[PDB]
Each structure stands twice: as C-alpha cells, then as structure tokens.
Amino acid sequence: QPPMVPHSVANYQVTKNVNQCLNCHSPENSRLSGATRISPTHFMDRDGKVPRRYFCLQCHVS
C-alpha cells in the first residue's frame, strides 16, 4: 500500500483544474513546507519516461 497520510485531508480539493495537495508536495514547494516531494514514480509514463498520479485520494488514505 501507498503510505498513509499522517494529517487531515478535509480541507484539500483535487479536481480537474485544482490540486491543493501540490501546494506542499510539489517539487517546487517541498523544501519550504516540509512535505515529502512526490517522487518521479508520480510523473513517469508506462515505460518509465519522465503528475500522472494526480487524483491523490484514489490511492492514499488518511
């Protein structure tokens, strides 16, 4: 299983044009927020070529 989310997810929307999880977990915000960056596994295509893993709460549970 993917790691559980150790914090609440109640305030964060994820829809076609909005992904509030990335305000902290994106590559550009991870250092500043303390949140672990989403890894290249979340960006790669089917063959490994380098997010495609976008709808975060389909996989991660809080």
Q: Which residues bind ligand HEC (CB under 6 A)?
A: 2-3, 5-7, 9, 12, 19-25, 33-36, 38-39, 41-42, 51, 53-60
User: Is 32 labeled as ligand-binding?
Assistant: no
User: Is 61 labeled as ligand-binding?
Assistant: no
User: Is 59 labeled as ligand-binding?
Assistant: yes
From residue 35, how far is each of 4, 25, 46, 51, 56 by CA, in Å? 13, 5, 26, 16, 14
- Report in angstroms how near the CB of residue 16 gets to ligand HEC at its nearest: 13
- Report in angstroms how near the CB of residue 42 gets to ligand HEC at its nearest: 6
